[PDB]
DNA sequence: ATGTGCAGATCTGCACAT
DNA sequence: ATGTGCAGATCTGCACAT
Ligand SMILES: CCCCCC(=O)CC(=O)N[C@H]1CCOC1=O
């Protein structure tokens with residue numbers, strides 16, 4: 001199946017609200033075996049966040065303003081280039097409340113990850129993090145820094161529009177699957193790209209189809225497009 | 231006291247009206263001294279543009295089908311990293327009607343330029359480009375990508391309408407059958423209602439499909455409805 | 461420019477166990 | 479509440495005329 005960056009690009013083009021968006025993010029993050037994702041939009045110290053990370057970990061992350069201690073975030077600030085962190089392989093270098101920070105984090109599968117920092121509007125920033133419960137991250141091929149930037153930029157933008165610009169939003173799968181159908185792919189081809197069972201694609205769409213009571217994909221497509229659903 | 235990518239990053243957040251956006255786009259090109267800016271979203275054979283470029287260049291570029299000629303577009307297709315194009319320095323190298331192209335383009339201040347290509351949803355792409363009248367011109371590719379991703383999101387997601395696009399059409403017959411198709415009718419059903427031979431509907435639509443080069447009614451209707459051909 | 465004719469490919473519609 | 483199987487229903491892709 002296509003890489004998570006591509007899945008993220010594909011996602012950043014669907015409607016509509018934060019709930020949907022969050023759902024799809026989680027789905028992608030799971031798919032590639034990640035404890036969760038974490039999108040942070042930070043302006044000085046105020047901090048907007050869309051994340052998967054355990055509700056507990058978030059509570060304490062903010063309650064203790066870990067945003068200042070977090071080495072990942074610190075690094076995200078000093079450079080807008082994709083990077084990977086481990087906490088373990090990093091433990092030897094400086095760390096004391098840091099060393100302890102990672103530990104508390106570990107209790108929630110957040111041991112290592114990939115973080116893509118973006119220079120956002122008005123001099124601010126955004127960073128997207130795919131978090132792994134493994135000690136470190138070894139990749140067969142390094143992820144393209146330029147590609148990462150381009151997709152996170154699209155996600156950042158997409159997320160911001162939630163709070164800037166029917167409400168029967170199709171759920172992320174119906175949406176992502178339907179958008180392929182709209183570009184010609186056949187279900188089995190969709191399944192091949194998404195890394196899911198043909199029956200998955202098969203079911204998701206017939207259900208959407210039933211919802212609207214239409215007898216053909218073309219109809220679902222026409223219908224979905226006309227109602228600004230995809 | 232800024233670079234244009236910076237201003238473009240900001241512009242990406244702007245609200246909200248279509249015109250408001252396009253103006254913002256032009257204002258940034260002007261502020262920096264650019265004959266213009268150009269945003270292209272290459273889908274299939276289908277192209278959509280949002281430009282500052284001269285009203286004439288626009289109209290001709292598509293009529294003359296320079297999509298397939300422009301050495302800048304071609305390069306962007308096989309490259310998704312920021313790059314500059316001279317037009318003068320490029321004359322030595324290959325150039326059949328290419329040499330003609332750059333000259334004719336020079337008739338509108340488009341001599342050199344900076345183009346940034348990005349990968350968008352469903353494996354398509356978009357590219358952003360700033361045109362200068364200078365013979366040639368003299369940036370962080372990662373930063374460049376991060377920005378354009380935001381602009382693409384902002385242009386793309388809010389359904390802004392193009393300032394131009396490769397022309398394509400549907401004739402009355404096609405448009406009538408496709409409109410039924412877009413309502414879940416089967417081809418046999420269509421033939422019965424419009425009172426014609428199954429094979430007429432078949433061949434007609436079949437023909438349109440070949441013209442746009444798509445493998446499925448859905449794709450065809452998805453396309454038609456999106457390029458307002460119906 | 462328009463059809464005919466067919467042979468896979470691919471959906472769709474149903475029934476049923478997971 | 480989903481995932482499986484299936485077969486009749488449609489469509490898509492050539493080949494060969496009109
Ligand atoms: C409340 C959501 C937490 C945001 C944290 C984040 O941005 C992602 C990140 O790299 N931080 C990781 C580093 C170790 O544990 C974390 O939390």
Ligand SMILES: CCCCCC(=O)CC(=O)N[C@H]1CCOC1=O
Nearest residue numbers: 268279288291302335340359394
């Ligand atoms: C409809 C207007 C077409 C815009 C396409 C574009 O991207 C332009 C561009 O960068 N290339 C330049 C190179 C020489 O003249 C151009 O068009």
